């Protein structure tokens, strides 16, 4: 699951088989870290018009 984003500590309670988390619009917004099982929220990098 390649991409660019900001990873933070997440309080989301993933089920013991879920590796990814998607929102309403089917964009990945949380991933379970494989090496150590921790949930990392994906926040899009700070884009915007100038």
């Amino acid at each position: 699951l390649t991409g660019t984003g900001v990873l933070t500590e997440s309080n989301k309670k993933f089920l013991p088989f879920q590796q990814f988390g998607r929102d309403i619009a089917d964009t990945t917004d949380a991933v379970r870290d494989p090496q150590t099982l921790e949930i990392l929220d994906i926040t899009p990098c700070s884009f915007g018009g100038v």
């Binding site: 390649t2 991409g3 660019t4 309403i24 619009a25 089917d26 964009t27 899009p44 884009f47 915007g48 018009g49």
Partner: protein, 418 residues
Amino acid sequence: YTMSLGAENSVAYSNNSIAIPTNFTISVTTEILPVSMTKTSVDCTMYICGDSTECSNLLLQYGSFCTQLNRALTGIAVEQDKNTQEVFAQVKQIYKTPPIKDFGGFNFSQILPDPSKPSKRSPIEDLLFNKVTNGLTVLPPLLTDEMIAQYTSALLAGTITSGWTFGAGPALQIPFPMQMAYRFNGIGVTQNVLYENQKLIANQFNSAIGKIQDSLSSTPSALGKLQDVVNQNAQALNTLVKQLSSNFGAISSVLNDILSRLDPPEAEVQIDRLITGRLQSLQTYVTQQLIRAAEIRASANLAAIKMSECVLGQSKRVDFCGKGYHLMSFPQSAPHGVVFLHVTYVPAQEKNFTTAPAICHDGKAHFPREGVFVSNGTHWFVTQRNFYEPQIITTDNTFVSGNCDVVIGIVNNTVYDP
């Protein structure tokens, strides 16, 4: 079932019978008009390609599609603020109601701002705001909700304290019972009818405003227009985001997978397939937004015209500012829209009378100066047309024209010379 078009009503027409109302009802009705959309902007290159650079190099071959899409979206975004400005910024002075709310018994507490609330919204406005709930950015509107409410409060204060004078020049103060007496004169009802019934009219108006608040609170489908606008915008944005999950005939919908699985020869054509699919989706979204923005601009122009002709003055246009004879209107700010409270005069408790076109007296034909001749069964009176106020037929409320030989249906009576 075959639908019913309404209740049958055979009006008791005859060639000498008239129905004159003996009472009236002060009714308040709500009109909801959307004013603005959600101002969205799209980073077209980011939407099509994300972070990959050779996808943007391929997208460069299409010229200025992204620039034109951004220009259209920017035009829509500026148009939304323009719509809000034309609807609400209809006065250059922020009027304030006096600290003492002595308006001859009329009570505007449900539409005047509530100082207790931090948002400075009226109870009706607070209820209205409570009911309505990948390179894409949402721009905030130029006018905040607090400033729109400040415009609304200024308009309310202007119409309460000055009537229609503040929309045509300097605000000229007038007591509110006399203002509503002017508005009664504007619909063909004499002002003594209002002065002699001031408490009843004030109670009817207060009850109607309270019923408006209760009706808005208890009906979840009353604000369906604004909710439809919000849902349409949200659904269009959701569709645009979900279009990125389509492969459009390519091996995958992810550019990274295509890049890491194929060499540039066939990766170029697969990425081109994705580019044309996503660009078509974006163009479809922008065209839909342009059509929707045209509809919202029509609604906003209508709302601005409603503001000018119903809030800043009394309108003679039938059914434009509510059902019935329009007295005055009050604006209320709503999310992405405006709510008008239309106060109208609805005649009630009509009574049958025998009428004549003219009265023959001393070989002369008398016609009412401003009223209508009615007979209660034995005696003939002249009354104003919208309210039963029988008066003795005299030479001051009638005028003479010719003799009695021409008018069809002229009846004999005595015209008293004062």
